[PDB]
Amino acid sequence: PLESQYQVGPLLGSGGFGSVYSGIRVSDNLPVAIKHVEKDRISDWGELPNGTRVPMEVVLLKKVSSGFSGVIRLLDWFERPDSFVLILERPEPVQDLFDFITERGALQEELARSFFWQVLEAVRHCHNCGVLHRDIKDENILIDLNRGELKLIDFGSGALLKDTVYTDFDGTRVYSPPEWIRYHRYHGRSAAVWSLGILLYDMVCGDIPFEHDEEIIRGQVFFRQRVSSECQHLIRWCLALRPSDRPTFEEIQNHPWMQDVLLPQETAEIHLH
Ligand SMILES: NCCOc1ccc(Cl)c(Cl)c1
Numbered sequence: 464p465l466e467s468q469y470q471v472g473p474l475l476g477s478g479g480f481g482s483v484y485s486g487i488r489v490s491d492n493l494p495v496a497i498k499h500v501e502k503d504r505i506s507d508w509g510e511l512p513n514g515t516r517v518p519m520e521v522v523l524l525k526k527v528s529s530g531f532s533g534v535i536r537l538l539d540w541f542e543r544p545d546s547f548v549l550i551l552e553r554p555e556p557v558q559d560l561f562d563f564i565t566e567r568g569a570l571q572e573e574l575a576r577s578f579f580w581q582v583l584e585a586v587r588h589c590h591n592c593g594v595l596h597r598d599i600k601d602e603n604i605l606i607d608l609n610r611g612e613l614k615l616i617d618f619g620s621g622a623l624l625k626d627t628v629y630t631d632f633d634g635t636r637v638y639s640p641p642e643w644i645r646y647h648r649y650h651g652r653s654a655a656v657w658s659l660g661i662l663l664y665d666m667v668c669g670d671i672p673f674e675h676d677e678e679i680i681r682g683q684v685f686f687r688q689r690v691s692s693e694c695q696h697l698i699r700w701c702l703a704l705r706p707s708d709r710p711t712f713e714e715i716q717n718h719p720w721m722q723d724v725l726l727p728q729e730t731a732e733i734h735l736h
C-alpha cells in the first residue's frame with residue numbers, strides 16, 4: 464500500500480489547498496511531494512476517462528501530466544476514507560516564486576522575462592489540454608533552482624476550459640479581474656491574461672499592484688520601482704479594464720518586451736547559481 468511505497472519526510476506547507484509533505488518513493492529513491500486533501504473540503508468533483516469519482520484536481524492533473532516539464536506532474540493518487548492522497552513530482556533544490564521575490568526583492572527584467580515566458584508556455588500547455596488553472600500567482604509557481612525551470616502547481620481551484628461564461632471563482636481575489644469583482648462573470652482566457660498582468664507587475668515591482676476591490680475596478684497602474692517603458696506597456700495591456708482590450712497569448716509573446724528570452728539553463732547560470 465501507499466504507506467509502504469513512500470517514506471514521509473517533513474511538512475512543506477498547508478492551507479486552502481490541504482497539507483503537502485516532502486517524500487521519497489521507496490523503489491527508486493525518487494523525490495516526491497505527498498498532498499492530502501480532505502473529502503469534506505472538495506466542492507468540485509469530476510470523473511476520469513474510465514468514470515471513477517475523483518476530485519476535479521485529479522482530473523485536471525491527468526489532462527496536463529505528460530512530457531512537458533512546465534506543470535508539476537501527478538505520479539499517482541490514492542483514496543482514503545476521509546481524504547484523497549496525491550503523489551507529485553518534487554524538484555530538488557526548489558523554492559516557490561513568492562519566497563524567491565520575498566528574499567530577493569524586485570527581479571531584474573532579464574530574469575522576469577525568462578520567468579514570465581516560462582509561465583506563459585505552461586499556461587498555453589494547460590489551455591491546449593482543455594484545462595483552466597484559475598489561480599496563477601507567485602505562490603503557485605515552483606522554481607527548479609538547478610535547471611532554471613518553472614513549474615505550475617495547485618490545480619485545486621481549476622476547471623475544464625470552456626468558451627462560455629464562468630460564474631464561480633475560488634482563486635485569489637487580488638489576482639481576480641474587474642469583471643469578476645463587479646459582475647461575478649468572466650471568460651477563461653481573458654481572466655488568465657489579467658492574472659498574468661498582476662504576476663508580471665509582482666515580478667518587476669516586488670509586490671502586487673492592487674489590494675482593494677476599488678483599486679482593481681479603477682485599474683490605474685502606478686509603478687513603485689524603475690520599470691522599462693516596454694515592460695510597463697505590456698503590464699498595462701494585460702491589465703486592460705475591458706476583457707476584449709487585453710492581448711491574446713500570441714500578442715503577449717510577440718510583444719517587444721518578450722524578445723530575446725534566455726534559455727532556462729542560461730537563466731540558472733546567470734541568476735540562480
Ligand atoms: N504550497 C506548499 C508546497 O506545495 C508543494 C506542492 C507540490 C510540490 Cl512538488 C512541492 Cl515541492 C510543494
